[PDB]
Structure 1
Amino acid sequence: MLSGLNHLTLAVSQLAPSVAFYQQLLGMTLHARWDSGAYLSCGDLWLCLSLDPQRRVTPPEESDYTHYAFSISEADFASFAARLEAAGVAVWKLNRSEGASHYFLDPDGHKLELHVGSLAQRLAACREQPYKGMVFF
């Protein structure tokens, strides 16, 4: 039986800028680094950065919608978004759904999101206003 997400591993083209982004800009805790990767944590999330010559710096128009959303409180959302903007971090989408969301790119074009709200909150909103063809279980 699967019990949760164990870790998220992102392939990176250059380890130093990716460590700077996740540790310094995004505030994650750096636990270890080696010649070809790093381990960080963000709350319960175990993040691994893996140096990979196969990683392309990928424009957002050229990748699919797969993305990784980090939790932040509503009270902290606007100042964190402003921090990313000050740092010149690109946005790949505007929010049009329930709950605050900021959609931003990592140095290699990994699609990231800041989101306020849980699955339970989303499901409650969907029950009141179901998406097209929506069924609940």
Structure 2
Amino acid sequence: MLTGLNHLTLAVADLPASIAFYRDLLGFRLEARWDQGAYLELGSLWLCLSREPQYGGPAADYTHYAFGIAAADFARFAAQLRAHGVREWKQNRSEGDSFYFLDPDGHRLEAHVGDLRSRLAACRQAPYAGMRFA
């Protein structure tokens, strides 16, 4: 019955800082803003920012949100965010270029070259420990 992802909503403590991050560094389009949140769009992704002034960010675990990027744009993106002072949380190890960075609250983000099909094809050629396919 479900059709795919409809929207992603992130708690944010500092709404102005988060809008500026997602709009200006990550290139989201700001579609609406109000006293307690904002709606942005990137491709078909609907992002909601929900203002929660006491929010401290997530604890340390592997939950994260990956955005796509083309191969030819990857190096420039990584270099741009590095030059802006963005903090990284992981060095890439899996198939396809990836840049693993934190948002202003500490949500874990990724910019990734590739998709599920390229991952599965790389895994078929070199399956992970215990790996089995559909």
Aligned-pair distance for 1:57? 4.1
Aligned residue in 1 for 2:113:
116
Aligned residue in 2 for 1:64:
61
Give the Cα–Cα distance (whole angstroms) in 2 for the partners of residues 57 and 39 of structure 1: 19
For residue 103 of structure 1, give the secondary structure of its aligned residue in structure 2: strand
1:11-50 aligned at under 5 Å gives the runs 11-50=11-50
Name stretches of at least 5 consecutive residues in structure 1 with no aligned partner. Answer: none
Aligned residue in 1 for 2:98:
101
The answer as to 2:83 corresponding to 1:76 is: no
Name stretches of at least 5 consecutive residues in structure 2 with no aligned partner. Answer: none
For residue 3 of structure 1, give the secondary structure of its aligned residue in structure 2: strand
Aligned-pair distance for 1:25? 1.1
Aligned-pair distance for 1:52? 1.0
Give the structure-2-normalised TM-score.
Answer: 0.97
Give the Cα–Cα distance (whole angstroms) in 2 for the partners of residues 110 and 104 of structure 1: 9
Aligned-pair distance for 1:86? 1.0
RMSD of aligned Cα (Å): 0.9
The answer as to 2:45 corresponding to 1:10 is: no
For residue 49 of structure 1, give the secondary structure of its aligned residue in structure 2: strand
Q: Which amino acid aligns with 1:77?
A: F
Give the Cα–Cα distance (whole angstroms) in 1 for the partners of residues 5 and 54 of structure 2: 24
Give the Cα–Cα distance (whole angstroms) in 2 for the partners of residues 132 and 54 of structure 1: 41
Aligned residue in 2 for 1:132:
129
Residue deviations 1:33-55 (CA, integer Å, cap 9, x gap): 00000000010100000001342
For residue 22 of structure 1, give the secondary structure of its aligned residue in structure 2: helix
Residue deviations 1:79-129 (CA, integer Å, cap 9, x gap): 011110111000001001110000000000000000000100000010110
Give the structure-1-normalised TM-score.
Answer: 0.95
Q: Aligned residues, how many? A: 134
Q: Which amino acid aligns with 1:65?
A: Y
